[PDB]
Amino acid sequence: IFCRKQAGVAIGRLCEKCDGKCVICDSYVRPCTLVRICDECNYGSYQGRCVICGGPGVSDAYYCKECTIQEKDRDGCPKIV
């Protein structure tokens, strides 16, 4: 289940285990569009946590080229909750 609220200026992050992965489709191939998340997902204790699984977040999350081509980057906040 994706949050799907209005994406903000906050940037999505990935933990070490979930890195390279597109948030929407788990592909390791061609990261393309930088992930944006809703404020509530960035708020307080949630600052810098992983979009896929809530881990410490070390890298910037991306939608892959296919998700970008399909405009799946536009659906809203993709933090899995």
The binding site for another protein (CB under 8 A) comprises: 6-10, 17, 27-30, 36, 38-40, 43-44, 65-66, 69-71, 73-74
* Residue of 49, 37, 38 lying closest to 13 (CA atoms): 49
Residue 30 Cβ, how far from Zn ion at the closest point, in Å? 9
Which of RNA, another protein, Zn ion, none does residue 44 bind to, with CB < 5 to 8 Å depending on kind? another protein
Cα separation of 47 and 67, whole Å?
A: 25
Burial of 77 (0-12, 13-18, 19+ CB in 10 A): buried
Which of RNA, Zn ion, another protein, none does residue 52 bind to, with CB < 5 to 8 Å depending on kind? Zn ion
